[model samples]
Target: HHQTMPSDLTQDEFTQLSQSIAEFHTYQLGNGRCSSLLAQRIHAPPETVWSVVRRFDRPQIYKHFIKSCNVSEDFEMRVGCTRDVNVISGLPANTSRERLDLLDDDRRVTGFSITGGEHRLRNYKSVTTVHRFEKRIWTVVLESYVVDVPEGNSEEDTRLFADTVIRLNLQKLASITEAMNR
Candidate 1:
């Protein structure tokens, strides 16, 4: 196992990400796994966009599915902080527990993994990175990779479910930021 923390996305990674125009994109991975990537630009500065997503204790701003977010003890905004996500509304039963795997304030990069919960997600991991392309335009890239889906479940279905939620959250985020600029 690798003890090293996840590294920040390099310039090359951003370059490859910029080539994609789709807000939600996905490709199959090995062993019946699915990998999805979302690249979107919000009309706001990096700091403004980061402030909304960097809040580990509160994710309801953009993610409408979350009902409440409770942070564990010794909760720090940095890595290692655990959060219990209550999803009583929108998405049926099934809560999510995640731990902050990485947080790079300098580069505006954040990552988390589904530690445990009733969600039954296996090896689910996500990374979100914000890149400032101009004074008022910032690009946010979010990638999620999951493996070991339920025996009877289809990976495409899972991808579609996630993609819809992701698109809505991105739209909400952009709408908020765009209004702030006006």
Candidate 2:
């Protein structure tokens, strides 16, 4: 994608750039979809976060943006676990029921989609997001690259609100775990 090579760029730079281009191509979906990133750092150890997040039934505890998020079936929080989220404020009262793509304490990658939602925003409101732990670090990040079928102008607003909500949730988790550790 780089149109012009920098005068100071070296052979190593060219190699790195080529590698990045390859990695970028690796995720190129035929549908031309994109994703966003939202990460957080908790003072508590990684295990503490994992323990709290593993409880799929307690959706209200992990995410803050939605008024009520619940799992319909009684299942472990792992790939194929079906969960639903109900957002109260917006029109048509949207809901996102998704399966967990990831459920591990060590790596922490949980992703889901809108298996079902309010019809008015059915395809329009559907989106996907993921939560994962950085390699061997106390920092845990949640990222979502969503494409509302109908599209909206609030992309920035969504990211801003999402970042705030995620940070608050992680902070709460860290606080609780820290207290328990003490």
Best by lDDT: 1
Candidate 2 residue lDDT tens string, 32-75: 23334333445566666666666666757656656777765556
Give Cα distance to truth, residue 134, candidate 1, Å: 3.8
Poorly placed runs, candidate 2 (over 4 Å): 1-34, 65-67, 73-76, 88-93, 119-137, 152-154
Clashes of each: 0, 2
lDDT of 1 by residue, 130-162 (tens): 766742456555555554566677877876776
Best model number under TM-score: 1
